[PDB]
Amino acid sequence: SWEVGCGAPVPLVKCDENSPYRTITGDCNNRRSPALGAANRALARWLPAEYEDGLALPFGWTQRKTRNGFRVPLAREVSNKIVGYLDEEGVLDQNRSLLFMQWGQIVDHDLDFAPETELGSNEHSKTQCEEYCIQGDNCFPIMFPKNDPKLKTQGKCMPFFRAGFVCPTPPYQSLAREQINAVTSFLDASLVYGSEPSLASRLRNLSSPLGLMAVNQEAWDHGLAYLPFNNKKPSPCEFINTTARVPCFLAGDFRASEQILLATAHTLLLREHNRLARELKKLNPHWNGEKLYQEARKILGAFIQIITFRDYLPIVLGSEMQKWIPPYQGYNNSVDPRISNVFTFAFRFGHMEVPSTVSRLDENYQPWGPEAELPLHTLFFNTWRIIKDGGIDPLVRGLLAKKSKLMNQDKMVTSELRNKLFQPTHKIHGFDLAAINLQRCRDHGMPGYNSWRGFCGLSQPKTLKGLQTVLKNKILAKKLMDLYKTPDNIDIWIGGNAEPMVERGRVGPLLACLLGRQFQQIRDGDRFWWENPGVFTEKQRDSLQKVSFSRLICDNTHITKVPLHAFQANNYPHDFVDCSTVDKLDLSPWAS
């Protein structure tokens, strides 16, 4: 009585024996269990789901019910009392560039997406959710506390719809509810190529036999490509400025236009693919378009893996890196590659790294124009600021020369996200990412803070004094206890992010364990890991060792001055070097 999955919403895929290249869906990576890590399957559960009724109802759904004998605090109340702050001065990370934040979002999007329950034409219950703040079915509104300023301005709630789940879409099938991961669990550049064959096809340039991805036909960046537009309305990107009427971009991941620096990063990756495909055709004129595309794709996937494991993870996990992610020793087909449900909350540590402004810089790394520095909230689903206001180069220079926000126990999430989030269905710059994260936590039936501390072999504080000690902060611990009553009830997103950061890292002990375990698994459990014997040639592996994010920029923009270590904080001109001194990727090993 151990049915291995709800297998009804996805037919089994037949596994080719040759398999030189990944599937788009992630099927067939694991030859013994082919759907493992594939898109459109349940997130893995590392611990059993915890719901109010044991099955699907989130904690907080029913008033009179409790969690462990106490009511759970309103998501927005926790946001207001713990997560918010006013003063941006002094909040920046002195040793992480803004690219550090941005790379995190890119990696996250490659790994996991649990999209809301849109079903079909549910615009009658959707408006009913927004309009009337009415809890039922997949409508789980974020209600404002008394004295919330947004009561004066926005009504009684923020609308919120439950995440999609496996087996039934409207009703229920009698296991605990399991949310779906709509993208591949492998770190594979699915955010560039898509996780479904339909989108993967749509994204490619099949008109020419050159293995290119489709590029914008309406605009270009001083001769360089943009992503194609998504030609389907409504377009939230058109809505935010109905004069410019610039649509959202079309990328391998639907979230690509959520903010302008994400759209930028997607643009770099797209350009890199086509640059690769062109170079490969030069070396191998006999290669057809399928070949050129797959070979370029495979390279780009290795680029993302190397940047992530070699440059990013060490400076997230700090002294904990080697504990959870020891030197690679090859593919292990016993490893579970699936993204866990908890990871999709753990990796939202990035939310506390996002600063309140974004800058455009000129070739002297000085403010670009009179509106050089923009408030982050103006840039949600904003593509017109790229198309009609200077292309990506000024934004890429900002990514290099400006800093991430530093997580701070007293200054957690900038008001640009916590009060001014724009959601692609709604009309206002009035949402709260923090409140949404907490509501989502409960939506997904997450075990509480202490359950995960136990999973990670860490102490489980039961009293105010114990929590004070773990968080190394008396005031924060006191405020959490006032809202949550027991640490057992603290939502993992807020409890994990509240912990002081490990040495040389940017997350605390609990998050290091959850993140570190997940990344270990997605490396060891991936048959197409770049360094796995058999995937690349030895010569190819030696060339790949040379990649850098600096080189990506040099190759794919009109920027010619770059730092050597792009994720640290770098000041111009002292830490910048000429591109012509930065190692390029040698594609000679790819000549057949």
Ligand X SMILES: *[C@@H]1O[C@H](CO)[C@@H](O)[C@H](O)[C@H]1NC(C)=O
Q: Smaller CB distance to Cl ion: residue 258 or 526?
A: 258
Cα–Cα dist 40/3, whole Å: 18
State the catalytic residue, choosing from 109, 266, 273, 377.
Answer: 109
Cα–Cα dist 281/279, whole Å: 5
The binding site for Ca(2+) comprises: 110, 184, 186, 188, 190
344 binds, among ligand HEM, Br ion, Cl ion, none (CB under 5 to 8 A by kind): ligand HEM
Beta bridge partners of 179: 165
The yes or no reply on residue 79 touching ligand X (CB under 6 A) is no
The binding site for heme b comprises: 108, 258, 351
Q: Scan for tokens 């997904």, then name that residue.
A: 444
Name the segment binding ligand X (CB under 6 A); options: 28-36, 148-156, 200-208, 471-479: 200-208
The residue from 15, 57, 119, 215 that contacts ligand X (CB under 6 A) is: 215
The yes or no reply on residue 311 touching ligand HEM (CB under 6 A) is no
Beta bridge partners of 536: 533
Residues in touch with Ca ion (CB under 5 A): 110, 184, 188, 190
255 binds, among Ca ion, Br ion, ligand X, none (CB under 5 to 8 A by kind): Br ion
What's the 3-state SS for 127-166? HHHHHHCCCECCECCEECCCCCCCHHHHCCEECCECECEC
Going from the C-alpha of 543 to that of each of 273, 548, 563, the distances in angstroms are 17, 11, 20
109 in catalytic set: yes
Q: Are 340 and 521 in contact (CB under 8 A)?
A: no
The residue from 353, 393, 491, 524 that contacts ligand HEM (CB under 6 A) is: 353
Which tokens go with 166? 């496996």
Q: Rounded to 5 degrees, what are φ and ψ at 552?
A: -50, -45
**Residues 106-145, interacting with ligand HEM (CB under 6 A):** 108, 112-114
Cα–Cα dist 400/179, whole Å: 36
**Residues 427-456, interacting with ligand HEM (CB under 6 A):** 433, 436, 440
Which tokens go with 467? 């929590």
The residue from 33, 66, 95, 154 that contacts ligand X (CB under 6 A) is: 95
Q: Which amino acid is at 504?
A: R
Name the segment binding ligand X (CB under 6 A); options: 83-91, 130-138, 212-220, 453-461: 212-220
**Residues 554-583, interacting with ligand X (CB under 6 A):** 568
Q: Smaller CB distance to Br ion: residue 67 or 255?
A: 255
Q: Which residue number has the CB closest to Cl ion? A: 258
Cα–Cα dist 585/548, whole Å: 9
| Angle, helix 549-556 to helix 260-283, in steps of 10 degrees | 80
Which tokens go with 571? 């000041």
Q: Smaller CB distance to ligand HEM: residue 344 or 489?
A: 344
Q: Which amino acid is at 589?
A: P
Neighbours of 1 (CB within 10 A): 2
436 binds, among Br ion, Ca ion, ligand HEM, none (CB under 5 to 8 A by kind): ligand HEM
Tell me the closest approach of the beta carbon of residue 330 to Br ion, in angstroms.
34
CA dihedral 98, 103, 109, 111 (to 10 degrees): -150
**Residues 19-78, interacting with ligand HEM (CB under 6 A):** none
Q: Smaller CB distance to Ca ion: residue 188 or 238?
A: 188
Q: Which residues of 273-311 are buried (b: 16+ CB within 10 A; e: fewer)?
A: bbbbbebbbeebeebebebbbbbbbbbbbbbbbbbbbeb
Give SS3 for 111: helix
Q: Smaller CB distance to Cl ion: residue 122 or 556?
A: 122
The yes or no reply on residue 258 touching ligand HEM (CB under 6 A) is yes
The residues near 226 (Cβ < 8 Å, ≥ 6 apart) are: 215, 216, 219, 220, 249, 267, 386, 387
Cα–Cα dist 266/524, whole Å: 26
The binding site comprises: 108, 110, 184, 186, 188, 190, 258, 351
Residues in touch with Br ion (CB under 5 A): 255, 258
440 binds, among Cl ion, ligand HEM, Br ion, none (CB under 5 to 8 A by kind): ligand HEM
The yes or no reply on residue 258 touching Cl ion (CB under 5 A) is yes
Tell me the closest approach of the beta carbon of residue 235 to Br ion, in angstroms.
16
Tell me the closest approach of the beta carbon of residue 174 to ligand HEM, in angstroms.
25
**Strand pairing category for 212-213 and 142-143:** unpaired
Q: Smaller CB distance to ligand HEM: residue 112 or 336?
A: 112
H helix runs in 525-565, sequence order: 538-544, 549-556
Q: Smaller CB distance to ligand X: residue 94 or 174?
A: 94
Q: Which residue ranges make up the site for ligand HEM (CB under 6 A)?
A: 101, 104-105, 108, 112-114, 258-259, 344, 347-348, 350-351, 353-354, 380, 433, 436, 440
User: Which residues are catalytic, by number?
Assistant: 109
Q: Which residue ranges make up the site for ligand X (CB under 6 A)?
A: 95, 205, 207-208, 210, 212, 214-215, 217, 315, 332, 334-335, 388, 504, 568
